[PDB]
C-alpha cells in the first residue's frame, strides 16, 4: 500500500502550463498621435 512518495517528489512537480495575456497596448504598434495628442486607433482592430 506504500506510495513511495518522497518529500522532493511531492513538493516539487512539473509546473502547470498557463498563458499570460499582456495588455493590447503593448501588442499594438505605435503611431504618431492625432491633433488632440491621444493615439487613436480603430475600435474593430483591438487585439487580445
Amino acid at each position: 500500500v506504500r506510495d513511495f512518495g518522497t518529500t522532493h517528489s511531492e513538493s516539487y512537480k512539473v509546473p502547470p502550463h498557463r498563458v499570460r495575456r499582456v495588455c493590447p497596448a503593448s501588442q499594438l504598434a505605435p503611431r504618431p498621435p492625432s491633433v488632440d495628442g491621444h493615439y487613436k486607433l480603430s475600435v474593430y482592430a483591438i487585439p487580445s
Binding site: P24, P33, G37, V43, Y44
Partner: protein, 52 residues
C-alpha cells in the same frame, strides 16, 4: 478585462490607446504647445511713413 466596444469608442469608430491599456503601464499625455513669441524690435519698429 476589456470593456464593451461602445464604451471604448469615441463615437466615430476610433478609440485611444489609454483606454485599451488595462495594465496602465502605457501613457498618451503628449499634447502640443506652440512657440508664442515676438521681440520688441520687430513689434514696435514697423515700417512707417507720414505726409510732409
Amino acid at each position: 478585462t476589456l470593456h464593451t466596444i461602445s464604451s471604448l469608442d469615441y463615437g466615430d469608430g476610433r478609440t485611444c490607446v489609454c483606454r485599451i491599456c488595462v495594465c496602465g503601464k502605457h501613457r498618451c499625455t503628449d499634447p502640443k504647445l506652440p512657440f508664442f513669441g515676438e521681440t520688441t524690435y520687430r513689434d514696435e519698429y514697423v515700417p512707417k511713413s507720414t505726409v510732409r
